[PDB]
Amino acid sequence: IFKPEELRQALMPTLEALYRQDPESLPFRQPVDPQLLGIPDYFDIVKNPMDLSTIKRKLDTGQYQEPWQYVDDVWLMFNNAWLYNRKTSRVYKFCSKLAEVFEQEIDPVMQSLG
């Protein structure tokens, strides 16, 4: 019911808005590498990692048939971050900032969709 190119053009601005957040999006632009980051328990806690680069691939290549599937992956990324990091930590605080930006942008777009 959703033309993949129309869904892509409708949702991509909201993804670009997260990328644009600097420094807040820096921890989210690529999949968490627990070896490089010295957090070897990460994958034990986070069973379904998600990040901006994986969402972009799926949005670019028509792997979201419905808008809610895009939104679910965005919130998966946020929930992983809030789950793994302490509420006072950098990554936790950057996550809440990104969730604020995302919520403001997505609701009009979801309204204009469906």
Give residues in contact with ligand LU5 (CB under 6 A).
23, 26-28, 30, 32, 36-37, 39, 81, 84-85, 90-91
CB 54 within 8 A of CB 31: yes
Which alpha helices (DSSP H) does 4-89 contain, by range? 4-20, 34-37, 42-45, 52-60, 67-84
Q: Which is nearer to ligand LU5, 2 or 78 (CB)?
A: 78
Q: What is the smallest separation between the CB atom of 58 and ligand LU5, expressed in angstroms?
A: 17
Q: Which is nearer to ligand LU5, 8 or 56 (CB)?
A: 56
Q: Which is nearer to ligand LU5, 101 or 113 (CB)?
A: 101
CB 110 within 8 A of CB 67: yes
